[PDB]
Amino acid sequence: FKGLTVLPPLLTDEMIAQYTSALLAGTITSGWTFGAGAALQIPFAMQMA
């Protein structure tokens, strides 16, 4: 080279995908409750109501 290199990111794409999967599972299963304290389950129909 000419002294110009690229450094790898700390978080791999698999880790980011895991974070996204966790967010999707939490929001599908517990609504907005998981973002304000303990995650409380609720059926999806009642959540959308």
CA distance 27 to 1: 47
According to the binding rule CB under 8 A, does residue 36 interact with another protein?
no
Least Å distance, CB 7 to another protein, is: 9
Q: Which is nearer to another protein, 7 or 46 (CB)?
A: 7
Least Å distance, CB 12 to another protein, is: 18
According to the binding rule CB under 8 A, does residue 4 interact with another protein?
yes
CA distance 29 to 8: 34
CA distance 3 to 38: 50
